[PDB]
Design a protein around this ligand. Sequence first.
Ligand SMILES: *Cc1cc2c(cc1C)nc1c(=O)[nH]c(=O)nc-1n2C[C@H](O)[C@H](O)[C@H](O)COP(=O)(O)OP(=O)(O)OC[C@H]1O[C@@H](n2cnc3c(N)ncnc32)[C@H](O)[C@@H]1O
Ligand SMILES: *Cc1cc2c(cc1C)nc1c(=O)[nH]c(=O)nc-1n2C[C@H](O)[C@H](O)[C@H](O)COP(=O)(O)OP(=O)(O)OC[C@H]1O[C@@H](n2cnc3c(N)ncnc32)[C@H](O)[C@@H]1O
Lengths: 550, 550
Amino acid sequence: EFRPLTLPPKLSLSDFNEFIQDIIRIVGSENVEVISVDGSYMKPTHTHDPHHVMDQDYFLASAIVAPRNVADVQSIVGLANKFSFPLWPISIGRNSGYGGAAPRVSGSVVLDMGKNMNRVLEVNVEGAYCVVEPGVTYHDLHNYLEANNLRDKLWLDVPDLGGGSVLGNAVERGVGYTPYGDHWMMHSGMEVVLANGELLRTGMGALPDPKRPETMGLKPEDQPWSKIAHLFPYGFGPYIDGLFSQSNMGIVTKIGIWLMPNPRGYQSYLITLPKDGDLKQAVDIIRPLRLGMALQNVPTIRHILLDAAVLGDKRSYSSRTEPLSDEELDKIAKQLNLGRWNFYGALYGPEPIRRVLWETIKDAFSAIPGVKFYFPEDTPENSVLRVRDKTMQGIPTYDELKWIDWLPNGAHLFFSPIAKVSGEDAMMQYAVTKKRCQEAGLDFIGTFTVGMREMHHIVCIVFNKKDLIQKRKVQWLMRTLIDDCAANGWGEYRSHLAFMDQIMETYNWNNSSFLRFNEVLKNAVDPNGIIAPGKSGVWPSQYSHVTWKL
Amino acid sequence: EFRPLTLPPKLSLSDFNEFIQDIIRIVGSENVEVISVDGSYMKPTHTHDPHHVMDQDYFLASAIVAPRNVADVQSIVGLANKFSFPLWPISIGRNSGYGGAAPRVSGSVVLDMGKNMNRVLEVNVEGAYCVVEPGVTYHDLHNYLEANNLRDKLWLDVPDLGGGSVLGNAVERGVGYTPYGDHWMMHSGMEVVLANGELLRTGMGALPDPKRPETMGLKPEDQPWSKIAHLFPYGFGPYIDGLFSQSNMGIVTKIGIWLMPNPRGYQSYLITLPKDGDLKQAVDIIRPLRLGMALQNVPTIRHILLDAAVLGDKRSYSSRTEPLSDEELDKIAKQLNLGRWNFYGALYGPEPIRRVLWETIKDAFSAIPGVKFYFPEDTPENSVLRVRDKTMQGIPTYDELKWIDWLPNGAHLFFSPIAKVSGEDAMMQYAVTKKRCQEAGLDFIGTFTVGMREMHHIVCIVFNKKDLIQKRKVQWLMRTLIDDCAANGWGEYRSHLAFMDQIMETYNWNNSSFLRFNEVLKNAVDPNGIIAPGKSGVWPSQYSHVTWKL
Ligand SMILES: *Cc1cc2c(cc1C)nc1c(=O)[nH]c(=O)nc-1n2C[C@H](O)[C@H](O)[C@H](O)COP(=O)(O)OP(=O)(O)OC[C@H]1O[C@@H](n2cnc3c(N)ncnc32)[C@H](O)[C@@H]1O
Ligand SMILES: *Cc1cc2c(cc1C)nc1c(=O)[nH]c(=O)nc-1n2C[C@H](O)[C@H](O)[C@H](O)COP(=O)(O)OP(=O)(O)OC[C@H]1O[C@@H](n2cnc3c(N)ncnc32)[C@H](O)[C@@H]1O
C-alpha cells in the first residue's frame, strides 16, 4: 500500500513500499494493513495507545502484519534486517494501561502474532501443563478445556479479564489470582525467533525429541518437544529464559504454562475492613499468613473506589468536579456493604483442610473491630466477590472492565510500585501516592496483590482521554510518583510506553550498571536493532539516546 | 612465586610471573599459592578434581587466589583482562562429584571467593530471607541462626551435606528437601562482578537505597540494598538473573535467599517399598500427591544400596569384588529392615493439617503390597530416617558422607538425568541405567528426588580412584549413559567437568541453536574470554573448539 502516516527512522518511502510489497507477497494482502481509531476492548486496536496519555497518534504504527505461521515470522524478520525496519511484536494487544498494542517507536510494523498463530498446541493431563501460541486468550483456553471435559482435572489462572494473551501476559511477567498466579513462574519450554532469524527453544526445549518415522522432515517450527521440555524449566547450562520477558531479545512463538490440578475443594471469600487505616493492621496480619501457606493464592486488597466503579460511574455517587472527601467514601462504604479496604481471598483443597485454614484466617482478622466475613452466597448478586469467585478458580470474566468508566471517556494507566508485605510500608506507599493524586485532582484507586514477600500496588489512574488539561496532569502525576517512590526505595514492576525510559532510569544503582549490561546483550543479538527498539528503556546503538528517550 | 606445573594457554612464564607479583601486591602473599594432593570434604582442595575420573592432574590450576573484599575481585578481573588470564571462581569448591574446585581449563587461577568473603550480611525476620557472601556454608549459616535464637523463627533448606556454599549451591541450581528445596528459585537480588570488572546488582537490587548520612561515601560493594531487594526477584525489564546460574557470565559476590519461617509443627517419615519393581506404582502415586500438594517438600526415593552404603562399606556386606546380585540386595533390604526402594518425606505445619495430609499419603501408598511406615522414633540409632529427619528441617549434617566410601578409594561422580513423574518413564530410565552400570561392573546406586512435575535422578557412581581400569570404565559408562538417555529423550540437569561439552551437545535442538546464542552473549560480555572459559560447554572465540572440547 501507497503512503503511510509515519515512516520508521532513516527509511525512505521507496523502501517502505518495496518492503510492504515483499511482505504482501509472503503473507498475502489479507494479512497486511497499512495506516494512511480507538475502538474497544473486544475489538482491540493494533495501531496506537487506546487509553492514550500522550497525543493519540504519538505512538503509532506504520503497518500491521499478521504472520500466518512460524516461517512467515522468519521471512518478515529476514526482511526487517535487510531494510532496518523496526518490528513491534504483539500477541493479542490488550495491554491497555501500559500502551496496548502501540510501538514505542513510531513507524514500526506491529506484528499481529495472535491473529493467525492461534492454536492451543497441547494440553497434557498427567504433567498438568499446556503449550500455547500467541493468539490464545485466557477465554480461548477456557473454552478449550470445557469443550474437552477438562475443567474437571485442570484449572486456569486468569488476570482480571479474559481477553488477554496467555503467553503475552506471561512474558510481561503479569499476575493472576490462584496458587498459580505468578504467570511467568509457571512457564517451561519457550519457542523464540531471534533477531537474526533463527529459531530457538529454551530449557529442555533444547533437548531434541528422538527421531521416529511420524516426525521426519517436519519443519523445526512444527516439531514435537521432548518429554521433559514443559516439566522442568532449567534444562542445562545458563538459564536464558528470563531474557525474553520484558525484553526485545526475542519474538516468542510458543510457551508452556503449567496448569493447576483441580484442588478437590473450593471456596472464595471477602473480609471487609471498616476504616481507611485498617490497611495497616490488615497487611500486618496477611504477612505471617502468606509466608506460612494459610493463604494459598494471590489475594487482593481493594480500594473502595475499585468496587464502587465496577458497580456505577462517578456521576451516580457525587456530582463533584474535585476528588472525593474522606467522609464521602465512608458513605460509599456503608452504602455498598463494603469497607474502605476489602480483602478477597480463596481456599483450595479438601474440606478438612479448608476448615482449619478458614478458622485461622477468621480468628486473625478478628483483632480488627467491626470486621465482617462473607462467602459469595452471603452477598448481593452484582457483587465484586461474585465475580472474583470465578476469577480465583480460573474462570474468565469481563465485569471488571466497568471501572474504567469512572470518568466520562474513561482510560486507565497503571502506576505499579512494589511494596513490602508490612503494614507500615504499605501505608507509606499509600500516603505518598494518595497525596500526589489529590494534587493532580484525581481520585485514588488501587489494589495490593499479595505475593509471598512482595505486594504489587496497582495504582489505577483513570482519566478523561479527551480532556487535554487532565491528560497533562496525569503525565505530571506519573512522572512524579515514579520519582517520589524511588526517593523512598520503591520501583515499578512494569511500565507504560511513555514511562519505560524514566522507570528504567530509576534502577540506576552504580551508575546504571543494569541498563549498560542490558544494552550490551541487546547489541550482540540484534546487530541492526530491529526487534522492539526502546522496550524497557533498552535502546540498540543505532538509536540515539538524545533523540529517543522520554 | 615463579614456576607452576601448567601455564594457561598463550601465556609466558614472564607474563605469569608479573601477573603473580601484581596479584600479591593487592591481596597479600598469604592469599596466593602457586602450584609447582586430594584433601578431604572437611578441608577441600583448590587445585584440581579430588573425585577425579580423568588423570589426577588433568584439571589443574596454575595458582589459587583469595580476594579479601569485592574491590580485590575487580582488581584481579582487570589483571586477567590485561594478561588474558582464565579465572575459575569458586565459593567453597565442595562440588565433589562434579569436579570439585578444579578449573575446566588447566592453568586457570582458581578464585577462592569463600576464604575471606565469608559473612552473613543479613538476616531479616519480617522479610524471611538472608544475604550471603560466597563463603557462608550451610553450617555457617545454620550456626549464625543459633547464636541469635532465630532458629525458633527461621528455617534453612539444605542439601545432603552441611558443607556446601549457600550461594555456591544456589547458582549451580542445587537441591534440598524442604518446601524450599529448589535453591535457585529462592534467590532474590544477587551481586555480580562482570568480566569487564563492573559491579552489577540484579532485580530490585538495581533500585538503589535512597540517601541518608549513615551510608554516604560507601563503595558500591558496601552499600545497603533497597527495601524490596530480597523480596522480589523480577525487578523491572529483562530478567537476567538466570544468566548467572550454571554459566561463565560473571563472578557472584553476594546473594539473597528466602528462608522458611518455622512451620509450627514437623513430622518426617519413611515409607519402605519391598520389590525392585515397586518403583513403578510408587512413582504413579507420587504424581497426584506432589501435584495436589499432599507432599509439601522434595521427598526422595532411595535405592537400597544408598542407604546400605550409609551404614557400612561394601566389604561389610560381601567380600565380592563385583556388583551385588539382585537377590543379595534382597538379603540386604531385610538385613536392616528397609525395602528395595525407600521413600522419605516430611509434613509441615500444625497438628490438624499434618494429620489429614499424613492420612492422604498413608492411604495412597498402601496400594503397594508389603508397604511399611516408620516415624523416626520407630528405627535404630544409626537410621537414615534419623539423619534425614534432621535434613528435611534444615539441619546441617554429614552422615551421608559414608556412602562415598563404598569402595576402597571411594570417590563419587554424578550422572544426573531428569525423569517425568511417571512410573513407566522412571522404570525405563532405571533399566537403561542399571544395565549400563552392570556392563561397567559397578553397583547401581541412586535417588530420584521429587520435583513438582519432574524427578532429579542422581545415579551415584562410586569408584576406586587408583583403579585405572575402573576410571576408564566409569568414563565409558558416563559417556554411554549420556547418549543412551538422549536416545530415550532425557537430558542431564547438571554436569561434571569431563562431560560438560558432551552434555551440551545433547541440547542441540535445531542445529545446536541453544549453544550458538549462548556463545554470542558470552563473547559480548567477555571480549577477552577470561571468565571460566568452557563451563557448561560455553567457549569464547579465542578457545578453539577443536583444541578444547571433550
Ligand atoms: C485495563 C485493565 C488491564 C489489566 C487489568 C484490569 C484492567 C481493567 N488487570 C490485570 C491483571 O489483573 N493482571 C495483569 O497481569 N494485567 C492486568 N491488566 C493489564 C493488561 O490488560 C493484561 O495484563 C493483559 O493480559 C495484557 O495484554 P496482552 O496479553 O494482550 O499482551 P500484548 O497486548 O500482546 O502486549 C504485551 C507486551 O508483551 C510483549 N509481547 C507479547 N507477545 C510477544 C511475543 N510473542 N514476542 C515478543 N514479545 C511479545 C510486547 O512487547 C507487548 O508490549
Ligand atoms: C559428594 C556428595 C555431593 C552432593 C550430595 C551428596 C554427596 C555425598 N548431595 C547433593 C544434594 O543433595 N544437592 C546438591 O545440589 N548437590 C549435592 N552434592 C554435590 C555437592 O556436594 C553440593 O552440591 C555442594 O553444595 C556443591 O559445592 P559448593 O556449594 O561448594 O559449590 P562450589 O564448589 O564452591 O562451586 C560450584 C560451582 O558453582 C560456580 N560458582 C561458585 N561460586 C561462584 C561465584 N561466586 N561466582 C560465579 N560462579 C560460582 C562454579 O561454576 C563452581 O564450579
